[PDB]
Amino acid sequence: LRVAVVSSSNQNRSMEAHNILSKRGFSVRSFGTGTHVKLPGPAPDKPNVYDFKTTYDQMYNDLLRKDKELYTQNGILHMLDRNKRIKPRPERFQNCKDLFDLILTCEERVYDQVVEDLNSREQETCQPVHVVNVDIQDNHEEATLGAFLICELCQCIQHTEDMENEIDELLQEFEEKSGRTFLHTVCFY
C-alpha cells in the first residue's frame, strides 16, 4: 500500500506520519502544499519563513544562530534533526511525479490544494487515487496523535479484502471512533 502524507509546510504533521509509517513497514512519501515553509517563532504572529528549496539542516543552523534557547525549548531543533534523518528537504506536492494508492492530508486547506492540483493534471490512465483528509492541528502533540490515527487507518486498509469497496465504510467507523471528520474523494492519473 503506497501512501503519501501531505501537510502545509512538510515539517511537522507529515513528517511525524512519514516517520511512523515508514518504521512500521509502509511505503510512504511526504509533501507540503503551502506557498512556503513556515516554522514557529518567538510569538504566534512572528513565524519563521523559508523557501521549499531550503534544507532542514540550513533551517536548523539558521535557527541555532537566532535563539538556541528558544528553539530548543519549543522542540524545533529536535524536529529539524528528525526531519534531516528522513530526507534532506521539504517537498512540494505540486512538483511531485509519483503514483499513490492513498493520499492523506492533514487539514482541509491542504486537501483543497491536493485536489485542485490533481484535478488540473491531464489524466492519461484513468487510474484512481483516493484522497482523505483528517484535520490535525499544527503542534507537536496533535501531530503525533494524528500520525498514530493515520497509522491505524492505513493498517486497517491493509487488512481489507477490497480497498475501494470497503474504504468509505472504514472511514465512517473511524468517524464514529474518533469524533473526527474524514473527507474523501478520488482523483485520476
Binding site: 484535478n119 491531464e122 477490497d162 469497496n165 468517524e175 471528520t181 474523501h184 474523494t185 478520488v186
Partner: protein, 317 residues
C-alpha cells in the same frame, strides 16, 4: 547484459521466458517486462512468434501476474492492432476474472483499446469477416462495461464510469470550442469518420454515444449512488463538457438536478466531499469559453454553495 551484443533478440527472449518459468514469486514480472520491452519495442517482428508464451501467464495464480498480462495485451495491440483478432477473447475473459483488481485493470485497458480498434475499423479499406467479428466482440465488451455501472462493487463502478466517459468522447464530434488534451490530439472522434463508410455507420455510433451519456445521467440520480461514484461522475461530466461542448447543456442540467436533490444516503462528510467537488467542477466549466450560454445559471449554483463573488470573477475569461 553481459555478451548482450553477441545475442539474437529471440535467444534473449527464450532465455528470459525460461527464467521467468523458474521463478515462483512476483519478481518474475520484472523478467516478463524485459521480454515485453524486447518484442514490442526492440524487435516487433518477434511479437507474433512469442505471443502465446506470454499469454500463457494469464492463468498464473498471482494477481499482479494477471495484471501484467493485461498491460501486455494493451501494448501489443497498440503496436499492431491486428492482434486484437486473437487477443479480444483473452481480454474479455480477464474482464471476468474472480479478482476485482484484475477486472478493474481490464476496464482501463479497454478504455485505451476501444478507440484504437475503432480507428483500425475506420482506416481499413477492406474488412474480413474475422475483422467484422472482432469489432462485434470489442463492441459487446463495451456494452458489458457499461452494464458494470450496476455492479455491486464500488471500485468496479468507478472504473466503468471512466470507461463510459471515454466512450462518450470517442463517439461524438470534436468542435471549434473543444479543449483537447495534448495526449489525445490524434484520437479518433465522430467527425473523423466518413459518412459513407462501407462498414462503420456514423449514425449508429452517434446513437450509441448519446445512449452512453443518458446511461450516465440516469446513474447519477440513482438513489443509493456512493460518494465516490457520484464524484467520479461529476468529474467525467466536466471532462465531457470541456471536450464536447454540445453536451454542456446536459451537464449543467445534471449539476442543477444534483444540487437541488442531494442523494440522501450520503453521510455528512460524504455530502461535504461531494459539494466541494460540485463547486470545483462548476468553476471548471465556467472557465471554458463555451460556458457563456450558461453563465447566469452556473453563477447562481456557485453562490448557493458559498463561493465568494471574487472567486467567481477570478474564474471568468
Amino acid at each position: 547484459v553481459p555478451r548482450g551484443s553477441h545475442m539474437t533478440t529471440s535467444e534473449r527472449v527464450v532465455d528470459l521466458l525460461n527464467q521467468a518459468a523458474l521463478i515462483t514469486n512476483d519478481s518474475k514480472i520484472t523478467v516478463l517486462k524485459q521480454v515485453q520491452e524486447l518484442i514490442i519495442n526492440k524487435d516487433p517482428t518477434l511479437l507474433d512468434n512469442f505471443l502465446d508464451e506470454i499469454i500463457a501467464f494469464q492463468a498464473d495464480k498471482s494477481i499482479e501476474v494477471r495484471k501484467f498480462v493485461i498491460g501486455f495485451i494493451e501494448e501489443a495491440c497498440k503496436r499492431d492492432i491486428e492482434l486484437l483478432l486473437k487477443l479480444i477473447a483473452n481480454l474479455n475473459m480477464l474482464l471476468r476474472d474472480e479478482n476485482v483488481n484484475v477486472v478493474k485493470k481490464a476496464i482501463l485497458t479497454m478504455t485505451q483499446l476501444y478507440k484504437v480498434a475503432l480507428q483500425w475499423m475506420v482506416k481499413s479499406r477492406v474488412i474480413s469477416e474475422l475483422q467484422e467479428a472482432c469489432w462485434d466482440m470489442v463492441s459487446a465488451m463495451a456494452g458489458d462495461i457499461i452494464l458494470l455501472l450496476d455492479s455491486d462493487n464500488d471500485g468496479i463502478r468507478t472504473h466503468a464510469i471512466k470507461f463510459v466517459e471515454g466512450l462518450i468522447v470517442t463517439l461524438s464530434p470534436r468542435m471549434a470550442d473543444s479543449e483537447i488534451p495534448r495526449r489525445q490530439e490524434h484520437d479518433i472522434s465522430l467527425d473523423r469518420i466518413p459518412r459513407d463508410h462501407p462498414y462503420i455507420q456514423y449514425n449508429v455510433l452517434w446513437e450509441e454515444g448519446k445512449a452512453a451519456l443518458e446511461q450516465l445521467l440516469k446513474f447519477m440520480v440513482h438513489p443509493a449512488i456512493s460518494s465516490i461514484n457520484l464524484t467520479t461522475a461529476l468529474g467525467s461530466l466536466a471532462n465531457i463538457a470541456r471536450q464536447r461542448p454540445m453536451f454542456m447543456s446536459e451537464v449543467i442540467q445534471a449539476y442543477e438536478t444534483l444540487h437541488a436533490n442531494l442523494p440522501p444516503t450520503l453521510a455528512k462528510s460524504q455530502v461535504s466531499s461531494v459539494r466541494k467537488n460540485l463547486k470545483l467542477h462548476l468553476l471548471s466549466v465556467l472557465k471554458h469559453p463555451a460556458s457563456l450560454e450558461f453563465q447566469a445559471q452556473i453563477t447562481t449554483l456557485l453562490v448557493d454553495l458559498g463561493t465568494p463573488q471574487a472567486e467567481i470573477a477570478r474564474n471568468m475569461p
